[PDB]
Amino acid sequence: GAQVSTQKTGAHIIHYTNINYYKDSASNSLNRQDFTQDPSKFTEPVKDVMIKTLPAL
Amino acid sequence: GAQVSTQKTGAHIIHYTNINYYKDSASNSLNRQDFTQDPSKFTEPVKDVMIKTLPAL
Amino acid sequence: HVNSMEAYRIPVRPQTSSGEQVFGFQLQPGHDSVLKHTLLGEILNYYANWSGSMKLTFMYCGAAMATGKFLIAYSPPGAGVPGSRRDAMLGTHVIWDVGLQSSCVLCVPWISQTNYRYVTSDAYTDAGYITCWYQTSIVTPPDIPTTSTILCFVSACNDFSVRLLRDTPFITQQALFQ
Amino acid sequence: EIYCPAPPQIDNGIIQGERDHYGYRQSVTYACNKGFTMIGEHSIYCTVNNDEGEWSGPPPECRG
Amino acid sequence: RAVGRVADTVASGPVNTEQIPALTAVETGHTSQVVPSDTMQTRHVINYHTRSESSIENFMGRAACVYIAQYATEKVNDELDRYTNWEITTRQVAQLRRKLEMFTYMRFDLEITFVITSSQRTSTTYASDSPPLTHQVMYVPPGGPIPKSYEDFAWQTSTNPSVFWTEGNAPPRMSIPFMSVGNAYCNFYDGWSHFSQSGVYGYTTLNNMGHLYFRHVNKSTAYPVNSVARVYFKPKHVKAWVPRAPRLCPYLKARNVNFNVQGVTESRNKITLDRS
Amino acid sequence: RAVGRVADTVASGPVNTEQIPALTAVETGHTSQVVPSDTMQTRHVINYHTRSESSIENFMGRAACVYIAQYATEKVNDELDRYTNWEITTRQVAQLRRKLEMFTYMRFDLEITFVITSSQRTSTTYASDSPPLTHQVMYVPPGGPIPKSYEDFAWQTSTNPSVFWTEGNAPPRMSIPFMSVGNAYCNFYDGWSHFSQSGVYGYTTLNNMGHLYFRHVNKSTAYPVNSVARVYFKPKHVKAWVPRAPRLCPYLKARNVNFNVQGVTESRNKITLDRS
Amino acid sequence: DRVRSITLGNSTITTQECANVVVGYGVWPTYLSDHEATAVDQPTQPDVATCRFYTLESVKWESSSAGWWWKFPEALSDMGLFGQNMQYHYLGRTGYTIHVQCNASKFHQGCLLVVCVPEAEMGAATTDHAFNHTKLSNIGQAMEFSAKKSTDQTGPQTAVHNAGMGVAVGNLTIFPHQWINLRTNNSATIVMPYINSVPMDNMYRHYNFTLMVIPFAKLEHSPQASTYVPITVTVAPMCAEYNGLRLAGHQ
Amino acid sequence: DRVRSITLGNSTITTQECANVVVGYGVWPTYLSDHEATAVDQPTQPDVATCRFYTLESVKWESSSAGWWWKFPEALSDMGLFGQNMQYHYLGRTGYTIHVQCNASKFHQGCLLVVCVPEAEMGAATTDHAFNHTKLSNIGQAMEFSAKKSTDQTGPQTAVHNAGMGVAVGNLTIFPHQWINLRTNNSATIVMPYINSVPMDNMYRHYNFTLMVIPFAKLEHSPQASTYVPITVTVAPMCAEYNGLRLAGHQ
Ligand SMILES: CCCCCCCCCCCCC/C=C/[C@H](O)[C@H](N)CO
């Protein structure tokens, strides 16, 4: 059961191959390809939403 | 003849690959993924069944 | 009394005042001297974590005409050791009545902030205390001896689980055997 | 508070746990010495019927 | 739910009924099946706890040392000869022996690892240029021709399995099938060896698994060197039958189950507790 | 756009309106979301800049040393014994400790690497022929039997994991799952150890991860040799919760968060600037 | 069968010689509905933290015994979070489950009447003299009827043949009751719903009912038998709720 | 508008110059679900009797002030049935609503930072010396940061520019916070959900977070103005539940 995913190349043959050998999941490689982010918990932790064009007060 | 089974991961890419190389069966890997259990031989070794809510005598 | 069969014998006798303590030990099923050397002790000492609830099944081994009542209590480790029966009735408890059924199962539940507790005890995962108090008394007819015996069995429920294999601190050696 | 007597006790026995002042519902307990067998119970306690005293029952005795 | 997943606690309410889940009888020899939701009020928790580390393959499947085989390059006695031997038995260490006497009958495939560590013997001087030493480990079956000495042509490994190892590399590994003649490895054999109830008592008469002969392939060294060969058994594909009570008292002999008596547990000072 | 790709600046024109994107209120505790195209005129550039090197797997996923374990072949004291130990804690170095106290709760799988470098001890002479030394690294869980000395049968690795290594090869590597009993690795534990608010304060009471015992498998050496074992932790599959402010003052103790006070930043001479 | 098991809160009670369960006047204890209620505030309803089997102190059955009476809820005033929710609240409405238990032998004899008397207003020992509020009901210790008439100056009337209230003591069997007959019975259990003319009331100035136990046939055994048989009461609230949270009382 | 009204339990709070409400890390406080829980007992959930606005003591904003820190829940340990449910229970899980309020005038000036720091482990004043458990957090009185470094033998480090924990004090704005700017703002309110790595924990040996208020721009007014401006904290638990009822602690 092979897995073929996208390599990390620059933005103006682009694949790689991963076979998990060991039976656990602690024995995997690093998960270097997760770039999801949600910064509204720290930037906008407010109860009433505040539009950036309206006055906040 | 490849075999693809489930890795051991926690419970809230998850596969592995096993090719047996040697012709025997003593030369296999460990069978770390058998979690079947039947404890009623040691807990309930009785001839007449005893329901846990009825009195045993 | 460990070098005889008097180790397993919890003695009970007719009392003069109710509410006295039968026995008492900490709930450490891999480290406490009561529970670490039993069948739940020698298997749990091969590991490092344990989860799930346990049982504590009793058995009155007295005369068939005697009569008693007991209150077996497990208290979580917040406020310390329960001092009397009034302090131990507030926690978990089971009132055991001695009749034709000669056994009663206190099922010590699983109350913890951590998913696992350590076998060799650390103060972060302390687990509690198990007591037992005279609920009323022992009342006997004439021509029956006073000292009786209660046998206490320990088991695990169907939600027990252990983790983190290690080697037992019970079988040591210096040199090889020949 | 009212206080029970000492009391003047006892023949052929001994005192276990003597406090000087006895109050409400506190019991004295008397064990007969080694060489004497019982006549009745051991422990009596203090009662209240009026504003003063008193003890509950008669003191025990032992034969040998 | 998945396999090996422990059961969860169902919800319960304040009952007042003729059902008594707490009262039972131990005289029937039946362990109680009391859920914690039978004697109190519990919520509905979901237990994701797996019983993975408890199975006999996960339990026994860790390599444990069984012997410390000492041999040298210049014979000084018969305990430190030019070769050595080891009658194959797993009852010489104290750690693996207790794990195998937790069950009466076992049936396991083995895989053996040798960690062979030479060390220079003390002398007046030590300066020499030494080629990397080579070790031979021959497995003589029960009944084969044992090597009476070094430089003997019983070491020819004509049919017996033999491994060779030049120092510096990975440790050697070979796997062994279920080598008994019965149908399980009897850890305990309550009986005698002869039919008139005599001979030797116990499991000595059933342990017939051969020998294991170690030697240096290199003929000479300018200043002698004492090697130490440690053998690492590890069971796999293991079945286990008729569980025993685990052994209390520590061992004395490698063939008997002889023991001194001791107390059942550690002693405290009083039976109750006292603190308010 | 792809994931982890930063946003680009839209076009803008000269506005004259009742919309005020620049005026806000910090009293609400809300960081402003002012695009540069809100307070000036910007073009339409397209940003291909990825945020790859900022994620917690790319950030923490580099191996950092945590201990320098020293042991020898001839005991001179108890700091340079024939074996040694290390109570497992990642708070003994200053580099990795700051990367882990940037978040309160972490949950990471580990992989451990040992770089073991022997070096000959000074003496009168040094000429000898030495076999390649072998090292054993045993991981005792919290509560197991520790080896009181060398030549003890607690080193039998009957159930504890142990690695062996003959000098000259690649460094050893093993991977470790999420070994806690809670649900996250508490880097900070603001509380006491006993219930009456006493004992020891802080995260010392929660770090119960065991020990790590190092020794030489080779019994002797003609002239002694001091080995140095360095341990290289590297987190992977990492989650991180509740980010802390990064620590200003440098550390003092490996169990406390004790510190000396210092200024918030480096001081200049005047608040303004002067040049025409 | 003759076995029953009650489980309330985190604590359970098992019996093996149990006669039956007398559920008051035929009413299981319930919560206050939306059309019987008067207080317009939101009530606090602790399910497991309050409704559990608080055990009292065990009283001794002498051969010359007369009887004992408890007064609820003021006899449950220093047990658990019951005695803490009673302080921080003006109102309070609950039902109870009272389990009186006494085992001796098959060679003892005796018979108790175990009754729950709603609003047992007790007469004075010496008239034109208002008696004390602790000679009616101390916090944990029961009280004791006398064998003869009382001559106290500031106590209640404790002649047990007049039951304290002034009625014939044998006429108490309309209040929900059982018997503990040492020939057959072992333990008596009564489930008493909330009995009052108001939906909720204060807990300190009003004892909603009174648990009296009285030995009718006295305890007699051989001299070589067990000369100490105890009587333990194990009372549990049921369906409790409180209203009007203010600072801690009770003055 | 600039007006908001919070109603929890039997008590309400009205503001007329309120900036906003900072709901933690974006999480409203909730109860423990059936798949995050560990304790197998039934929890007691008092709705109105616990979740209400307990007000603390009002501290004085001096002109030479440094700052103050409270430590929750141990700063709420003698208020109402919160401090009684904390004694009779091993575990405890709750969220909070913290309302710091301070009005002076339109002729005063000053600016506070009002922050809720999860697990603010504090460094010692004199090292190699374990400090006292009451120099971190007394039961009702707040604590006070010093203006300079501390030289105490058994206290914490109270230099306010290092915030006690050892970090820069200006970097505290990632923990959910507000500001009380006397030019515009009047009161700061933060809704903090339950933040811990375990579902439920003990309440006495663990302070789940720490409310620090620090005057950044100091209080300065005319000499003929009001020379006493107070700072009151009004904290309310939310969605509280407790587990494992045993006798009263906390030793
Ligand atoms: C090239 C070298 C190969 C070496 C081959 C050796 C294989 C023989 C090992 C026998 C495996 C079973 C060991 C005996 C276990 C017993 O049943 C119990 N311990 C009873 O004492």
Ligand SMILES: CCCCCCCCCCCCC/C=C/[C@H](O)[C@H](N)CO
């Ligand atoms: C064969 C040798 C195997 C060695 C096994 C060691 C694995 C144990 C390592 C524990 C991993 C977590 C380390 C502790 C991190 C803490 O949560 C924080 N640093 C708090 O101080």
